[PDB]
Amino acid sequence: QVQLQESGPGLVKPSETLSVTCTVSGYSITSSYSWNWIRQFPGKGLEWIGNIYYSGSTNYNPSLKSRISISRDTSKNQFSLKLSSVTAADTAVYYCANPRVWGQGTTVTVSSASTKGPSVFPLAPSSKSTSGGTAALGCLVKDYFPEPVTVSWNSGALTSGVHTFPAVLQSSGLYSLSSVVTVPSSSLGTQTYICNVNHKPSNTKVDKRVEPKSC
Amino acid sequence: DIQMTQSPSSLSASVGDRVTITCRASQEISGYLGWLQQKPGKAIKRLIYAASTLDSGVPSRFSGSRSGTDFTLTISSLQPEDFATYYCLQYASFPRTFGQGTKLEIKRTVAAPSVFIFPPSDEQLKSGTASVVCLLNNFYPREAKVQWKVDNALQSGNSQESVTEQDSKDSTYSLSSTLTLSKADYEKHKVYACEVTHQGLSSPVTKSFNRGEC
Numbered sequence: 180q181v182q183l184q185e186s187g188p189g190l191v192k193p194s195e196t197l198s199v200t201c202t203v204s205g206y207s208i209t210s211s212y213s214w215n216w217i218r219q220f221p222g223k224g225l226e227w228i229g230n231i232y233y234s235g236s237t238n239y240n241p242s243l244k245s246r247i248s249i250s251r252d253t254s255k256n257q258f259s260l261k262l263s264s265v266t267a268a269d270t271a272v273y274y275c276a277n278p279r280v281w282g283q284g285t286t287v288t289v290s291s292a293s294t295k296g297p298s299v300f301p302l303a304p305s306s307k308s309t310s311g312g313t314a315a316l317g318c319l320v321k322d323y324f325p326e327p328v329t330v331s332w333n334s335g336a337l338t339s340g341v342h343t344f345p346a347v348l349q350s351s352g353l354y355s356l357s358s359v360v361t362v363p364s365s366s367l368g369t370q371t372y373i374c375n376v377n378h379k380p381s382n383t384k385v386d387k388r389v390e391p392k393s394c
Numbered sequence: 395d396i397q398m399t400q401s402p403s404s405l406s407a408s409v410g411d412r413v414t415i416t417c418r419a420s421q422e423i424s425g426y427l428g429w430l431q432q433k434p435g436k437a438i439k440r441l442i443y444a445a446s447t448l449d450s451g452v453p454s455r456f457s458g459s460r461s462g463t464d465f466t467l468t469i470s471s472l473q474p475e476d477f478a479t480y481y482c483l484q485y486a487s488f489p490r491t492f493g494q495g496t497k498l499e500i501k502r503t504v505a506a507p508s509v510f511i512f513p514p515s516d517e518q519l520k521s522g523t524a525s526v527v528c529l530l531n532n533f534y535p536r537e538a539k540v541q542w543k544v545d546n547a548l549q550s551g552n553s554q555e556s557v558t559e560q561d562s563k564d565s566t567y568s569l570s571s572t573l574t575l576s577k578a579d580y581e582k583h584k585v586y587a588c589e590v591t592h593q594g595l596s597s598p599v600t601k602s603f604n605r606g607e608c
């Protein structure tokens with residue numbers, strides 16, 4: 180029955196306090212279980228941050244004990260992590276979990292740099308992206324900060340054949356990725372394709388129509 | 395703290411093969427260890443707790459066992475969807491601690507990539523930069539070489555690669571290579587090509603276009 184969902188600012192300045200919140204549905208956090216915070220670093224390592232039990236009792240990882248608090252709001256069925264005196268080393272995906280179920284996580288980056296929404300450019304289908312009745316098309320999602328972006332196609336109606344590549348940090352210090360999809364070549368003159376790019380940290384939403392090469 | 399040493403760091407095995415992942419605890423943890431599976435675009439999933447208790451819904455090919463402070467996850471009869479990173483977690487003490495993880499790749503028959511090329515958009519060409527994209531579809535193994543050529547001149551230091559996670563169905567990869575050029579350099583040259591080499595290609599595959607052609 181338990182479902183968990185993390186929320187929090189995606190960008191925090193160094194030396195400030197990072198706050199993330201877990202909203203729990205389908206079960207009271209006062210009934211039973213530990214309610215845990217865990218993080219995963221860019222290097223992929225996992226670290227258990229701490230917990231709060233159904234009783235309200237807390238346990239903190241000793242490596243973080245001087246700059247951590249976990250609290251709860253039983254009236255909202257939420258529990259929260261505060262991490263103070265943050266550095267760039269605190270950049271991570273933050274997950275909440277009971278003993279079995281984990282949330283999908285929320286990405287937090289610690290940096291002095293301001294947020295930037297992406298530019299979105301079409302990767303047009305043409306003769307040079309078509310073979311044997313299959314055509315490839317896409318969107319280039321360029322120059323955003325910080326992670327992540329979400330990319331859908333046709334407002335979520337197109338999922339088959341979609342590949343959204345991992346972001347790469349450019350030499351500028353800004354992220355870039357491409358999202359591509361393979362579709363029937365017969366559909367190109369007829370079916371509209373739009374990539375929908377959401378960058379929550381900058382509250383940027385972009386729709387980009389991807390039309391066949393008109394030359 | 396209680397330290398979990400997980401080995402190996404990565405594995406590659408065929409459909410139907412058996413793999414063993416091991417976690418050793420720095421001290422006694424009784425049977426208080428769980429196994430976790432992280433798949434792309436999915437929340438982390440618990441497979442096993444108390445060393446050997448399978449969670450409901452988890453296929454019986456996943457088996458947890460222990461001998462003293464040595465804990466093993468044995469995955470038999472591997473399936474394409476078993477591609478993931480696996481972690482152990484001990485909860486015998488505070489703090490809870492994780493193993494370093496094991497990346498599992500599923501082997502399949504060698505498959506050569508199909509190669510597509512995308513010129514920069516007219517919209518981007520309004521800016522100072524032109525990006526050219528070469529796409530490699532549905533290949534195995536993961537290792538692939540992309541060489542960019544501008545008017546036959548080999549490029550270096552101006553391209554970046556990104557690879558998808560392994561497909562859960564056909565066990566293939568896809569790759570994007572992006573060549574980043576100044577608009578000033580882009581409008582000077584004519585022929586833009588990506589040359590692809592791979593284990594499944596007997597000779598390099600080149601995809602090219604001529605700038606500005608209508």
Ligand SMILES: CCCCC/C=C\C\C=C/C=C/C=C/[C@@H](SC[C@H](NC(=O)CC[C@H](N)C(=O)O)C(=O)NCC(=O)O)[C@@H](O)CCCC(=O)O
Nearest residue numbers: 211212213215276277278279427428429440443483485490
């Ligand atoms: C340790 C938590 C770390 C955060 C998650 C990370 C990794 C998960 C790996 C292993 C988890 C093992 C859990 C074992 C349960 S045993 C299985 C566990 N049960 C309970 O926690 C007991 C609750 C029950 N009300 C009772 O007290 O009898 C459970 O998962 N129940 C509900 C369900 O099946 O959905 C207990 O023996 C220890 C719980 C200790 C704790 O919660 O801090």
Ligand SMILES: [Zn+2]
Nearest residue numbers: 340341342361
């Ligand atoms: Zn595909």
Ligand SMILES: [Zn+2]
Nearest residue numbers: 579580582583
């Ligand atoms: Zn040049």
Ligand SMILES: [Zn+2]
Nearest residue numbers: 545582583584
């Ligand atoms: Zn030239």
